[PDB]
């Protein structure tokens, strides 16, 4: 298949390597405050795990939505790719397993952590978009 | 690739640069320690502020060499292909941007539709060899 | 800078720790400790004060940060409390009769309360919603409130007659009125010894902590029946000489000052919004 | 209780909030004490109430208001039939094992079997069964008994010797040892005593405690004293406070409540 | 909210909002201070009514527009709260309280931060032209003496009171500017009169100054170079008080449209103690 | 059997099956000991109802020499010396209202080991080298006066030679447990005749003993800390009315006082060399 692909771009045409779970997402373990103040106990915002092929993304508030319009709060995470994947089979969950017990957690600048203790609810209204 | 290839530290009028890809710009603004009194009462130490400090630049690539294709000042063939595509009412298709803006077809530029539009360049110079 | 709009804060999961900084928050701040009066009749001393801020000079604090201040009883405490200093930590009796009024203390003492003026005379008054309250403060407060319908109507009271209308606060230093979100209501407030305020709680209030002297521990600090949450920066000892109180709160003054922040508001980046 | 599987899945839509046609076709019912309605002394206060319940959603004919004396008066036969009860209980110091007994006897719902203490010796089963005795005056004397039928410390026939253990109260829940039989001295001129297991508790009436701090070990046993979901406590200077409180919150009130 | 240092981009090309003031009429409310004399000169019992009646027509709720009164600008300097989201304040001129007026919108306009002075035991000095000591009460009698690097008052005697040099005599509210950069000894009057060593942060921008008569006599800075007229600064020319009142409640929407709500202080005061 | 003093890493498989159910065992093999102040037999009226609660013990699994019974006259006299015995220890004690640091000192001292150094208040001056160590005084009547010194050995607001310039932490107390800011020299003035005062470092909690609070809400603060009022598993309370419910409470639920106490850490024979006692 690599001198067959080293041939073909030797020419300049189309190729493909079959990947299976590719490793197209650097390490990235961090999170996102929409909402925060010094004191971490209202908190809201994404959290992500990227590793190798897989992405575990949770958002949580901590006011489970009392105040936003309707009792809903969106959220969203765009992973852009380095690659252009194609023909790719996912295998799309509920409900991320690493960010659904409790943990402290450094803070942006690394001063002071805060307590994570999450209760989950189902994803409402999952829209999984890919883009190009 | 984040290499410092060529700097130039308060040089004006025409300079070159032999390779790069991200074009870094750090000028700074020093209040002036020896002011006249027509400049000393602009620039009070209270809050309201009438005349704001600014600070320009300007940066004008007059010619470049570059491997993929552009459209430029000098060349019609984004004019001619846009021409053909526009004379004859033709539907958006799956690379190229709706309406062919340069603008949305230069932000995401990529290799496949640099690849059309390099196959399309090329055939537009060949008509404008023939068709004047 | 930039300060007014809300910007999303993102940071990574394995950023390094910081160092300790208990010692430059001690160096830094400051601290009040809040007594009632007759304990200085049980202390049996002019200068300790002298005493005290020389105990606190072991734990990190400098000499002229630690403040000592008094007040005569809860209810003259509750008439205006005004907390500023970096860390306040207030020192109450427990009375089993005044158990309603440390409550309404403590419900003002640890939550922040954007606060507008009101009008008896003028105008019809309702709540929006379970955050909005009625505080009234001064000397003597005594609140009747008096509903109405959709046409202004009295429902159960007469608009007229001050008499009929329903008393909810008698003579009391502190009162928050709770009444239901959405009703017009007419008020009775005497104000040449008092002064009630509408005021709509923004979130708690941090650089205080509630100790209180004695007793069984609750203070409910919320309206509802349904939860009465026993906070991070309320609690409880016991006494019989106020020297182990003074004492024991000298020792912890690291861990009562870990379970209180630096009071958002306070900060320069919560300029625009409610406090510079 | 059901005991028949219902599957259900996951990933399915929430249904709308029903709370609404909860309110539309449901009723509301109050327990005061008589010294709640001394100092109110409004003779048409219900009306009030009702039209700030009208306010919130309820229909007009779905509220209503029950007095009791004191606690030792609602105890004697209280009776909980509205689809969602709250009752409004002042805080005695002295009376602190009484209100721990009420709200057992409220909170929880019992299957109890009768008792006739003449005929037959009594000995409970469970850790959940317990005596439960009504009445005017209840003065219950229990000995216990061996395997032979004699006496442990009592003689079974005098009853100077037996072992008391309730003198004159209304209600009394009692708890002896299980697996040992029993004779029993209760006064049965007044007092009715019932053979009494705990099922799951009723989530029809929550106890709005008002007064001092809580004291509620509804459970028999001395390790738990689980604080549940409807031993609500308000602090209180005047009884209209006390159910203007009420008339606002009745969502975070009725939310932790269901019907039965 | 914390994290300010982030910048905030935005584009040169995106579209306008659509018109955010009535929404602004809503959710605030409204406090105009007016002076005694006006309610001498008004003769009314119900004009409150009257006057929030016609706030009412203007894109006002009733439960928003209230009014506070004081007696004299020497008496509001004492204690000066603000109560509500946009404060406005009627001011009568004289010639008489010329820096009573400046002095009064300079604590009026803008946001202060103060801390206490025990002038009893400390020396206290000023560091740049940004802090100044703000001192309250019924009656402030403030005396400074300045010293020099050995501790000794030049031109004056520290021991002796009477060889002080008085700045202010019997006022209400006093700004003193000293010369900054050198010790200073005090006698100010601590039995009617708190004296505050407080710097000037921003500009406060939920209360106007409507100076009602005179001429265009005030100023924020108190250096002689500067005298600012900001957008907040505006006057009326008075005869009876019924045109003014009648001026405020018509120009509503532009005298919000030179405010702003965001600077809300959660405290009615002026000065941000204990930072 | 052996190795006494080392603390070696253990290491057990997550697969080991469940052991059989050891009550039995533990009902047959150990004692218990009940501690109930005199106004219970004074409200029970009878000699022999030590018996009727031995037998109804024999119908819950506890033999008849397995139960044993002591008892004190105020929560004041019980706190001057508890030397608590076996190998299951609960004790019942009434809420007294106007009494509630008693109680909570005494269930300071109950539920926790205390390993305590004598003190010479004449000799020495004491500081606490941290929060562990307390200083439990006993006795018939403990007066402690405490003279905070500087880094000189000179007083803080207390002359060394004057013993009124000091300020007293307790007066005519039966069991005092002082906590003082730590670092800091200290003079005392104990009342030495009636009172012994010493230096203890609480090493955890004890493990054989409960305390049911009969009567009265729930007032215990363990840890001499204010941020702290831990509520453990056997600091468990009841309503009374009269004393037999108490006692037919505690004798239906020794199944449950006893699970959720153990044996005592210290006293096994594994704990040999860690202060066995
Ligand atoms: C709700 O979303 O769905 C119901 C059907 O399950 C429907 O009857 C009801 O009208 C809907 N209400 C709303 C607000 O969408
Ligand atoms: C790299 C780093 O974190 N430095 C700090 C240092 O500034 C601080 O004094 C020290 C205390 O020992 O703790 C370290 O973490
Ligand atoms: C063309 C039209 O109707 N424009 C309206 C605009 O006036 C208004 O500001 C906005 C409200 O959000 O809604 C738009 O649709
Ligand atoms: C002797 C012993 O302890 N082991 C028995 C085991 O033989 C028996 O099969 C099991 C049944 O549950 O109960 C265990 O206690
Ligand atoms: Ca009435
Ligand atoms: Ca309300
Ligand atoms: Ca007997
Ligand atoms: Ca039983
Ligand atoms: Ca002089
Ligand atoms: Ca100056
Ligand atoms: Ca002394
Ligand atoms: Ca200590």
């Not at chain 3, 930039?2 to 910007?7: D, M, V």
């Not at chain 3, 400790?33 to 200085?40: K, M, R, S, V, W």
């Not at chain 3, 049980?42 to 300790?48: A, G, L, R």
């Not at chain 3, 970096?86 to 309360?113: C, G, P």
């Given at each position: 298949?690599?001198?067959?692909?080293?041939?073909?771009?030797?020419?300049?045409?189309?190729?493909?390597?079959?990947?299976?779970?590719?490793?197209?997402?650097?390490?990235?373990?961090?999170?996102?405050?929409?909402?925060?103040?010094?004191?971490?106990?209202?908190?809201?915002?994404?959290?992500?795990?990227?590793a190798?092929?897989?992405?575990?993304?949770?958002?949580?508030?901590?006011?489970?939505?009392?105040?936003?319009?309707?009792?809903?709060?969106?959220?969203?995470?765009?992973?852009?790719?380095?690659?252009?994947?194609?023909?790719?089979?996912?295998?799309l969950?509920?409900?991320?397993?690493?960010?659904?017990?409790?943990?402290?957690?450094?803070?942006?600048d690394?001063?002071?952590?805060?307590?994570?203790?999450?209760?989950?609810?189902?994803?409402?209204?999952?829209?999984?978009?890919?883009?190009? | 690739?984040?290499?410092?290839?060529?700097?130039?530290?308060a040089?004006?009028?025409?300079?070159?640069?032999?390779?790069?890809?991200?074009?870094?710009?750090?000028?700074?603004?020093?209040?002036?320690?020896?002011?006249?009194?027509?400049?000393?009462?602009?620039?009070?130490?209270?809050?309201?502020?009438?005349?704001?400090?600014?600070?320009?630049?300007?940066?004008?690539?007059?010619?470049?060499?570059?491997?993929?294709?552009?459209?430029?000042?000098?060349?019609?063939?984004?004019?001619?292909?846009?021409?053909?595509?526009q004379?004859?009412?033709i539907?958006?298709?799956?690379?190229?941007?709706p309406?062919?803006?340069?603008?949305?077809?230069?932000?995401?530029?990529?290799?496949?539709?640099?690849?059309?539009?390099?196959?399309?360049?090329?055939?537009?110079?060949?008509?404008?060899?023939?068709?004047? | 800078?930039?300060?007014?709009?809300?910007?999303?804060?993102?940071?990574?999961?394995?950023?390094?720790?910081?160092?300790?900084?208990?010692?430059?928050?001690?160096?830094?701040?400051?601290?009040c400790?809040?007594?009632?009066?007759?304990?200085?009749t049980?202390?049996?001393?002019?200068?300790?004060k002298?005493?005290?801020?020389?105990?606190?000079?072991?734990?990190?604090?400098?000499?002229?940060?630690?403040?000592?201040?008094?007040?005569?009883?809860?209810?003259?405490?509750?008439?205006?409390?005004?907390?500023?200093?970096?860390?306040?930590?207030?020192?109450?009796?427990?009375?089993?009769?005044?158990?309603?009024?440390?409550?309404?203390?403590?419900?003002?003492?640890?939550?922040?309360?954007?606060?507008n003026?009101?009008?008896?005379?003028?105008?019809?008054?309702?709540?929006?919603?379970?955050?909005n309250?009625?505080?009234?403060?001064?000397?003597?407060?005594?609140?009747?409130?008096?509903?109405?319908?959709?046409?202004?109507?009295?429902?159960?009271?007469?608009?007229?007659?001050?008499?009929?209308?329903?008393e909810?606060?008698?003579?009391?230093?502190?009162?928050?009125?709770?009444?239901?979100?959405?009703?017009?209501?007419?008020?009775?407030?005497?104000?040449?010894?008092?002064?009630?305020?509408?005021?709509?709680?923004?979130?708690?209030?941090?650089?205080?902590?509630?100790?209180?002297?004695?007793?069984?521990?609750?203070?409910?600090?919320?309206?509802?029946?349904?939860?009465?949450?026993?906070?991070?920066?309320?609690?409880?000892?016991?006494?019989?000489?106020?020297?182990?109180?003074?004492?024991?709160?000298?020792?912890?003054?690291?861990?009562?000052?870990?379970?209180?922040?630096?009071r958002?508001?306070?900060?320069?980046?919560?300029?625009?919004?409610?406090?510079?």
């Open positions: 298949e690599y001198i067959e692909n080293w041939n073909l771009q030797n020419r300049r045409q189309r190729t493909g390597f079959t990947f299976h779970k590719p490793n197209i997402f650097p390490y990235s373990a961090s999170f996102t405050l929409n909402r925060s103040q010094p004191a971490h106990d209202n908190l809201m915002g994404t959290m992500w795990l990227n190798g092929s897989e992405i575990q993304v949770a958002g949580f508030d901590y006011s489970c939505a009392i105040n936003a319009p309707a009792n809903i709060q969106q959220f969203e995470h765009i992973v852009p790719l380095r690659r252009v994947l194609t023909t790719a089979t996912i295998t969950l509920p409900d991320a397993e690493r960010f659904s017990f409790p943990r402290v957690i450094n803070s942006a690394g001063a002071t952590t805060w307590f994570f203790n999450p209760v989950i609810l189902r994803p409402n209204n999952v829209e999984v978009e890919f883009l190009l | 690739n984040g290499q410092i290839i060529n700097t130039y530290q040089r004006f009028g025409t300079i070159v640069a032999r390779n790069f890809d991200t074009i870094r710009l750090s000028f700074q603004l020093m209040r002036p320690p020896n002011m006249t009194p027509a400049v000393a009462v602009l620039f009070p130490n209270a809050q309201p502020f009438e005349h704001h400090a600014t600070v320009g630049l300007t940066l004008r690539i007059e010619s470049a060499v570059c491997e993929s294709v552009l459209a430029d000042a000098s060349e019609t063939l984004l004019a001619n292909v846009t021409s053909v595509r004379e004859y009412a539907p958006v298709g799956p690379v190229f941007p309406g062919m803006n340069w603008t949305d077809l230069i932000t995401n530029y990529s290799p496949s539709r640099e690849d059309n539009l390099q196959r399309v360049f090329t055939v537009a110079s060949i008509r404008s060899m023939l068709i004047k | 800078q930039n300060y007014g709009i809300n910007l999303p804060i993102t940071g990574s999961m394995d950023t390094a720790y910081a160092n300790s900084t208990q010692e430059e928050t001690f160096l830094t701040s400051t601290l400790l809040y007594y009632p009066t007759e304990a200085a049980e202390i049996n001393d002019n200068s300790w002298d005493t005290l801020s020389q105990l606190f000079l072991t734990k990190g604090w400098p000499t002229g940060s630690v403040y000592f201040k008094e007040y005569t009883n809860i209810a003259s405490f509750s008439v205006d409390p005004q907390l500023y200093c970096d860390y306040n930590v207030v020192l109450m009796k427990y009375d089993a009769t005044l158990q309603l009024d440390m409550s309404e203390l403590a419900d003002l003492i640890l939550n922040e309360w954007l606060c003026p009101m009008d008896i005379t003028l105008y019809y008054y309702q709540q929006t919603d379970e955050a309250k009625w505080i009234s403060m001064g000397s003597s407060c005594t609140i009747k409130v008096c509903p109405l319908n959709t046409q202004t109507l009295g429902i159960g009271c007469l608009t007229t007659d001050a008499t009929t209308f329903e909810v606060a008698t003579a009391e230093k502190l009162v928050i009125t709770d009444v239901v979100d959405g009703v017009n209501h007419k008020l009775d407030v005497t104000t040449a010894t008092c002064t009630i305020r509408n005021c709509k709680k923004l979130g708690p209030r941090e650089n205080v902590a509630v100790i209180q002297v004695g007793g069984s521990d609750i203070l409910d600090i919320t309206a509802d029946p349904t939860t009465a949450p026993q906070t991070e920066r309320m609690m409880r000892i016991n006494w019989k000489k106020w020297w182990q109180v003074f004492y024991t709160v000298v020792d912890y003054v690291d861990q009562i000052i870990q379970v209180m922040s630096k958002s508001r306070s900060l320069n980046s919560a300029a625009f919004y409610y406090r510079v």
